[PDB]
Amino acid sequence: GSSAGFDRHITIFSPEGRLYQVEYAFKAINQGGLTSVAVRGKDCAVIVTQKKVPDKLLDSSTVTHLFKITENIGCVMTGMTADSRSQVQRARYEAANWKYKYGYEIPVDMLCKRIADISQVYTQNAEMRPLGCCMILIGIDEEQGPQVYKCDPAGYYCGFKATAAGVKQTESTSFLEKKVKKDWTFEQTVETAITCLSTVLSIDFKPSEIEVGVVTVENPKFRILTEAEIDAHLVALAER
Amino acid sequence: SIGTGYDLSASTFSPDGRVFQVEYAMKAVENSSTAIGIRCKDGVVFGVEKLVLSKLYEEGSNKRLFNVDRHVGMAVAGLLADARSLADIAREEASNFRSNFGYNIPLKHLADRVAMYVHAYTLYSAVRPFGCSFMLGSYSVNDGAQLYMIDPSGVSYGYWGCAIGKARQAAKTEIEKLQMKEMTCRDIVKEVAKIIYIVHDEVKDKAFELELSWVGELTNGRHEIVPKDIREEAEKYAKESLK
Amino acid sequence: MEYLIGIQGPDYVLVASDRVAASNIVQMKDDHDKMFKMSEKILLLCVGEAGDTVQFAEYIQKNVQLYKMRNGYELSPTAAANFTRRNLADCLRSRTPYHVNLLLAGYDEHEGPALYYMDYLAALAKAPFAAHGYGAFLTLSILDRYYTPTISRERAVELLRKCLEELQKRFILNLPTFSVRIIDKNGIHDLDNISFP
Amino acid sequence: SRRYDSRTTIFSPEGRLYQVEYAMEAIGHAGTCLGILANDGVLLAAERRNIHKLLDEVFFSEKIYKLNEDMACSVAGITSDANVLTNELRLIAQRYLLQYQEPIPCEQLVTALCDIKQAYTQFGGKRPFGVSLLYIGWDKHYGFQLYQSDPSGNYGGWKATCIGNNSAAAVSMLKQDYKEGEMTLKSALALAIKVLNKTMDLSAEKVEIATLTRENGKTVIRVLKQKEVEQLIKKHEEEEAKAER
Amino acid sequence: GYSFSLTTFSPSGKLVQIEYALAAVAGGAPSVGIKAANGVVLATEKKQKSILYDERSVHKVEPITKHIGLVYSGMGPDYRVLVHRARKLAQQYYLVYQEPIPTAQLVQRVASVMQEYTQSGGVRPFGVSLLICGWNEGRPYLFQSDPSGAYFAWKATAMGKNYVNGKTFLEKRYNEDLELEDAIHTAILTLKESFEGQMTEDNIEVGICNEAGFRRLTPTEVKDYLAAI
Amino acid sequence: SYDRAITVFSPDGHLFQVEYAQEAVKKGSTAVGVRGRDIVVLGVEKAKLQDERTVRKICALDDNVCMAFAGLTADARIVINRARVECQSHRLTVEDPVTVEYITRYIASLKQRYTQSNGRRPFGISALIVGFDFDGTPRLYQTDPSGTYHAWKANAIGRGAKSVREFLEKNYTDEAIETDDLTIKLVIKALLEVVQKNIELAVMRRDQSLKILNPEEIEKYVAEIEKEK
Amino acid sequence: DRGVNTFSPEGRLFQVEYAIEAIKLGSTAIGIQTSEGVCLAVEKRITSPLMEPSSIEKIVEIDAHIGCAMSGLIADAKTLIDKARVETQNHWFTYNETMTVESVTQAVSNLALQFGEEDADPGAMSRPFGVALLFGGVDEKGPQLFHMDPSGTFVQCDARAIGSASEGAQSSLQEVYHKSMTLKEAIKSSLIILKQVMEEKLNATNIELATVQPGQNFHMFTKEELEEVI
Amino acid sequence: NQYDNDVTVWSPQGRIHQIEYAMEAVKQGSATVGLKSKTHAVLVALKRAQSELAAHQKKILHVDNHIGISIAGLTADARLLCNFMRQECLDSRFVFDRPLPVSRLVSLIGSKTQIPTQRYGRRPYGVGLLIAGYDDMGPHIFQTCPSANYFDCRAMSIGARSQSARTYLERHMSEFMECNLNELVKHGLRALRETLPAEQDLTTKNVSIGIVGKDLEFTIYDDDDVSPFLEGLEER
């Protein structure tokens, strides 16, 4: 794992063909302390993350990692919070701009490819640093059904059956692949995402400790779940 | 502080995924005089421990409270010239909203816009992050009372109570004692002064001057300074409580 | 209004131009030279609008001179005519078009004598003989009548004299003196001015 | 930012441009490429370095580039850098032709590219082009010409020159067997194969020759075919064997 | 921005950032190109880290225009930049000449962009090598463009992890007169030389180019090629 | 654009890039200039396979002015061409041709600017500018990477400028400025003190053009130098 | 490396500090302001008999009533001299009058910290000017002599010396200067002090002398005039 | 060591050393004093000479009819800032036909001088000013510094040995508002004096005064103009 010149300071190749500054941006995602899970069902797509509000002095409704990009597209950001807000503003811009030029709402994959391409620029130009954050987008495609996409500070992007980001990403993915190996209803999809975050963080959740976001084939508008709606899922999982 | 080149630019991450230039800029706020803001049932109130650097200065020099818009107020902590440059940005942001949409900029929206001008200075070797943290307060019938805070990183959160500076944590454990959600701006002013006097270090620091401002139903949603009458009454209670 | 003429022989180019510099109804100058030596074997005869002529001709002259200094050899009459053409045509659709009408005479060691015609629009034509100005309407037919490609220089001067005499008899403009010059294997030779006293 | 700046356009304490000198080093690693001027024409002989069995051979050449109706060139160095420079050479030749309606005289085309190469050494903060060129041509002023230019933007006219791998050895070998004014394309082609044989570690697949001649008042540029080149190396092999006997 | 080059000549005469970009390519998943008599094949390893990935969502074998196709070894996000640029360049040619761009012409235009990132200020070279296939003037074409901006016309070649072995395999295994059907079987076999795991129609990707233009093979088409071992 | 200060002051008050540009001048071929009464002679120091015409270091800028150089040849070409353009642009603006001082002041101004503007290194050349003014006075000047310029009776620049200057200081007499051939002999004798077909001389007599003598003509003077000793 | 606009821990820009050190390498020049006019004198510092002494012009005329003495990098001075001459003629054009000595000195002075790298014009200065100037001239305020250095700081002087032997020449000036001394005595003191500080002996070729007095225009002393002074 | 080079670099202490180095320029200049009464604003400065033969540098410059300044630091930066102030004042009278309110001018100085403190390759202004003005809020004394921070002052002193002037201004602070012009100028002259070594006293050569107030436009007194004021001070 060698270094030569300014390969650990700027986005220029290392002797092994690596981009150390991009590698460091992945470590910045974990600096936030949070973990996020996203699962794709038969007729739905859910996103879930931790909701750490340590002082009662905060206004709990302003503390969020879930965002509405468009009416039918939502996202869960993981990493450096301001870097995350910046990416959400750009995602919103690119999406509104797309409908303006093309007369149709941006596909989930196109918005993910777009944000990923913007992120790649930072990976090639030295005068700026990558964003220390991970974006996961959900939405219902008119012809392809539910979609779950994620993009990296590296500029990579992909579609997923289920995905994770943050501190316990490795463990969350290990868990998510074990359940997908062994029918994905809306309840089955919500319960899986909640119990992935819970078993991986070893925390039996309270309704204020997590935030759930969902898109449904019946109602494709990105919906963020209430504490009561979150509790109805939490209690039904405990019944089992 | 990792002194190996990884901390000289905001376009450079350290191996553990940190941007030290932003952290060093946050340390300028950590060395600053404390500013506090409290959101209550009918408005938002600001109070600042404005340390008196010289007996030669005028009463009210170096105001750490600004009017960003007719309904928005700003309480700063950190490098004052950066703080005042952010006041001008926020002012122009509010001015541009009215020119675009014909009505007063919603506080959450102003906080979001200004926090992204702050964020922008945390990505490049070409520019320096702002060595400043600030709060925005507002009150309207439609939106209610709103208090937000932005840090050198560009993060913007909504608050019921907030403190920034040297005594950031000490002020917070005192603000936590108050049940603001059920209080008025006439009652909460007395408490803001009490908290600022408690948090002040008479030994390590020299004399200080208390700056008090508010925006609420009592002011018709306009950001104003607390009149001399009410300020003297709150300072009298703050000194009497200390004993 | 002004007059330019060229007659190319087998091994030379004969050129002549009026000597009048006139403003309004007055003849300000009787001894005005309208030919600009570009090279040792190239002359650019230029007429047209008030300022445009000296401005355009001198720009080309200094650029042909810069070529000589830069490369050690001169432009050929063909390259110098096409370079004149490129600049004139490039200004045509610009804010500042040049109203200049010209003839480029020259002698090349490889291609021999060449005479070119160019109007203000920058159309370039190689002609055995040419004329610019209202005078060309009275003299192109005299040249059509008597010009032959084997015309000796002595004969071409009698032909040029027949054209200049025609302008005295029929042209309403007073053009009494003309500059006469021959370009050949040995360069530009000044001949006696054809005068009408 | 000052920290990350390479300082590519600055002088060293002894009045040296290090980037220009390090670009020369790159050219020494590139294939050997020679040029020989003769009375009836001028030639270019270069070592092919794309010499693998699975290569397709879509183009007429590898190192030989036609620039003009009357001019061609060969390169030694960074091939992508050489593509930029040869493409610019073609644009300069057409800008001259459009303006004067005569083809660009050989030395003028070389100077124009050398002025771009020189600019890369004096300003901009960019690295130079890692290429040396050998130009062959014909013009109405100096006839058959052979030029050479390097990354410094310096150029010169030559009767025989070499650039690339073992350039130094080839110039000493060319210096000894070259006969000023008495050279013909036939004898110079024999000399080209004699030199490349010693400066390489040779078959028609490993070499690539091109000639510039004057046929009926028009210039003829032609890269020689494998069977032509094969006969020229077979002929050398015969004279070399009959030298010991 | 940073107006100075980030790729400079080392004292030995090497453009070290280009050498380091080639290392990124040599560590990428393997890719193969084979020029058959009546077509061209492009094959790659599309093996993802977990079952959770949706393989159908992103592609390694991409179309440029109707008759040109593309594949790579190296940095995935860098590749996407060159794909967009290549598709744009192919439209600029078609708009002017009203004729499908010759493959040599596309490859030279794409290779010039790659050279740009080795000299232009404040940028690093692309960490990718492309394998460009096409069909024009009734014949197939196979090119490779590397991070320096240099291009090569190949009859058959390998890139990425275990390319030295794949190239020796290709040289000995097949030559000219191969039919496109045969060549796809060869491309799959050269991928099998350095394939850790069971090969499926989801962890490999193939694209073909013939008289009918370029197109990516469907997983059902790849499945029938894998049925023949 | 590249906004970086290249030439700056060092703690001892030096402009190091200009002194490094003077070290590049010191490595160039020796150039001698002698100012006569009705003539001005410039001479330079000198491969068998090279074309002598393409490597000449005496250049005519215009009919009245011509110059010689020492240092970076590619740098010198850019200065020589910018001066050639300024001679014609001067005749276009003013009506009169350039005075030997005007173009020297011009070249010097260009040189100075490259020592004080961003992203540029100084020109690694010195020049000896000879000619006659419109009044007919013979003038010899000298410029250097800094931008400073002065007039001279005789001067030398390049590899061995110190020893040729020492010779010319002791040998520039009114007897040597008497006949045109004695002025030419001073230049050849001065160059013979550093160089060993190794000289290139150019002469300018009052109204006639710059005459570049041939090698046989040079050998005519070289033979008489050995005889007079 | 550090930026050209970097401050030293003492509060001075390093580039300006070093530009002042460059002046310590330049030829020594003296100026004396008298009721009867200002005198300017400078050593040419000739390095070869082959060099034309006339081609060294260290005393220049800015306008008919203003002269300039320079020291340091004489190529850097040539740019500021032209800027001064252009300034006087633009003022003459706009206002139909002459400039005061101070106004000209201030104009040249405004170009001093106009150097930099980032955020500057496409043809901006990278470094300061390594020159010191003495502006001696006459206006309505009488004879005036001004000093200027690379920091843009200009001051009015009764007597000033700049260059290699600045310390010594100023010491000598201080002991002999009186506010009511004649211009004849001012020239003599300058020529004596200049003779003292030079390595080479004083000659009519070796030095430059010039005066500006009411009722006369900036005068550059000829060899014949300099011989009768020496 | 590493955090000294550029203004965009924050030290691990949350400090910007380039800003602190620029402020050292103010501290190296000669002392200047500014003070105000209920009707007037006074500026006094010890002009310092480079030798007996050289003159004492101009320490006080005109900005507008109602505003005048005294400088301490880089004289070229002081002239850049003076022309910005003069121009901002011209704009206000051109547009509004009313003098630019002194506190507003000072905000513009704080705003424009902050810009370089946050851009790479840029440097702070190496000058600090004392501003004397008069408007609808009476007389004012302001202080600007390389930091881009500014202060509204009752009295003030910047430069070398200025801390000595500050103690006189703090001790006599109470008398300033009810002071007449002669007495207010005396308070300033006396604070200026305390800076100068016990070796030297104020002189008609090395003293500069600037006065603005209720009926007087900004006026600069320099040599025999200074004499009336100095004709009362004579102890220590």
Ligand code: NA
């Ligand atoms: Na980057």
